[PDB]
Amino acid sequence: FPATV
Amino acid sequence: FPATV
Amino acid sequence: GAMGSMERASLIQKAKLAEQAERYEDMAAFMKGAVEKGEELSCEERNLLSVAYKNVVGGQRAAWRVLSSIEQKSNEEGPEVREYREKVETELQGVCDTVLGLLDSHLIKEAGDAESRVFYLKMKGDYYRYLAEVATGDDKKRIIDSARSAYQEAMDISKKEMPPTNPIRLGLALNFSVFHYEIANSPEEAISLAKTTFDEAMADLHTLSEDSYKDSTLIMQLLRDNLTLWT
Amino acid sequence: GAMGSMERASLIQKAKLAEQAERYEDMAAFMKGAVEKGEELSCEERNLLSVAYKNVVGGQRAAWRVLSSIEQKSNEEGPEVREYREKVETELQGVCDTVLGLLDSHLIKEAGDAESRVFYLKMKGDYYRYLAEVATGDDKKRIIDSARSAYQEAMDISKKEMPPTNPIRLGLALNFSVFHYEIANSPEEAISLAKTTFDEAMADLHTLSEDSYKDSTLIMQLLRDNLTLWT
Ligand SMILES: C=CC(C)(C)OC[C@H]1O[C@H](O[C@@H]2C3=C([C@H](C)COC(C)=O)C[C@H](O)[C@]3(C)/C=C3/[C@@H](COC)CC[C@H]3[C@@H](C)[C@H]2O)[C@H](O)[C@@H](OC(C)=O)[C@@H]1O
Ligand SMILES: C=CC(C)(C)OC[C@H]1O[C@H](O[C@@H]2C3=C([C@H](C)COC(C)=O)C[C@H](O)[C@]3(C)/C=C3/[C@@H](COC)CC[C@H]3[C@@H](C)[C@H]2O)[C@H](O)[C@@H](OC(C)=O)[C@@H]1O
Ligand SMILES: NCCCNCCS
Ligand SMILES: NCCCNCCS
């Protein structure tokens, strides 16, 4: 999955 | 800490 | 409510202890109690609220993904996997509704300064995005549009009031770019947003103090990681 | 009770799904529901019960250790750290009492075969040992003796009925050795037990099938790790 913050 | 299982 | 009899300072102190102990459910409950005292959160307090709920919902989303994958394999060429996936899904939805309720009852209307306003609107887009990940009914389009509208309002303010290296501005762009890619089926918009955000921040790193932007440096690496994954 | 309306097979199936999803609180609740159906657990089912509670109490013990350490620094040369450490401690105690209650009401009296009997008595010693780690009152000595008596009964049976390479026999020796070292202030007994256990199992590895004892191999490495830490 792509990274989020 | 020592290992336990 | 549940934390009604505890002093606000004690709830904040206990939220910090729960963070050190990795007890994110307790940390979220203490921070909800603190928000419910009715005073505006400080910058450090806003971070505690966000970390606590991001960790709680993070665990539920990881579990939902595992269950959803097992369920998808069971329907290829019993009721238990579906029942358990629905249980996890309802718990996840309950946590997102709790966060969205705190944002819309306390935090958003009182936030006047750009930094807090963008922070809470980013959270609103994040929690609507988590609800969109599990939405399967006639409500999915409205949930997705609620996430988009929150992210878009936050983007409009951050571009006007914050420098391009501000970690909240960068984090919002990182997450709105992921929303475009994963939720709105707009990979070109996701890529354009991550690229412009990274490029604009790179050109502004000349104005910053050396050890003052470790968070922005980490977010810039995450934009680059996504751009590498997508291109 | 809470899981009273669900079929036993469905509870076991859901316990396995919860394990894959890393939802150990759900896994423990499903396994408690399955034990409460009144049928004896199978070997695979006993492992599910043990893993679920070991992970739940593991997290609480890690948190208690962090809080206890902060509390110790605050009393060197407010009430919040103590209050929160006591909250975590009471939750941990509640989980140990739940496991001990299941062991003493269902599982131990019905276990006739050596493998299950030693498994449940090892669990009884483990959960009394976790209660001893936080015990500070006039009850501490009795709790420690309850852990010792459970481990000792399990040791007596395992030496008579199981080969020295049996993973349950090895795991019991690993944990009873840690009890001697950390709880009973008997480092010489802890070292002697780990050394004899390791040596006896090494001499019996000649009788085993190549890929059939990965668990015993892992436990033997843990005995060696403790012996290295202590000597
Ligand atoms: C519980 C909070 C603790 C652990 C005390 O702080 C978390 C972190 O809190 C701050 O960092 C924030 C922050 C994060 C940084 C990227 C962490 O940076 C490093 C270097 O670890 C991730 C966090 O989840 C947090 C609080 C959240 C956000 C996110 C919130 O959306 C609503 C938007 C971007 C980002 C902002 C607010 C960051 O500034 C600080 O700037 C960080 O310290 C440094 C040196 O960068 C600290 O690690
Ligand atoms: C949820 C359980 C799953 C993940 C399905 O199984 C856990 C594990 O279950 C079994 O292993 C047990 C077992 C463990 C093994 C040491 C794991 O081995 C490897 C190679 O990972 C640790 C577990 O906590 C468990 C179930 C517990 C005990 C412990 C219980 O005390 C009351 C005594 C020693 C040990 C015994 C029962 C082990 O046999 C199996 O032998 C393991 O498989 C292999 C190939 O060794 C499997 O990983
Ligand atoms: N370890 C203290 C982290 C402070 N983060 C900045 C709050 S705005
Ligand atoms: N992955 C299945 C694990 C089986 N372990 C042996 C049960 S006694």
Numbering used by the authors:
A (entry chain B), B (entry chain B): 591 to 595
C (entry chain A), D (entry chain A): -4 to 72, 78 to 231
What does the original paper state about this entry?
The 14-3-3 family of hub proteins (seven isoforms: β, γ, ε, η, σ, τ, ζ) play diverse and important roles in maintaining normal cell function through interaction with over 200 partner proteins. Here, we report that WR-1065, the active species of the approved drug amifostine, covalently modifies 14-3-3σ at an isoform-unique cysteine residue, Cys38.
In order to establish a structural rationale for the cooperative stabilising effect of 3 in combination with 1, we determined the crystal structure of 14-3-3σ in complex with an ERα phospho-peptide (in the presence of which the effect was most pronounced) and ligands 1 and 3. The crystals were flash cooled in liquid nitrogen and exposed to X-rays. The 14-3-3σ : ERα crystal soaked with 3 gave a 1.19 Å resolution dataset and that soaked with 1 and 3 gave a 1.48 Å dataset. Polar contacts between Asp215 of 14-3-3σ and 1 lead to a shift of helix 9 (aa 210–230) in a clamping motion towards the ligand. To provide insight into how the predominant binding poses of 3 relate to that of 1 and ERα, the Cys38 side chain was first modelled in three conformations, fitting positive residual electron density. The third Cys38 conformation (occB = 0.45) points away from the binding groove and is free of ligand.
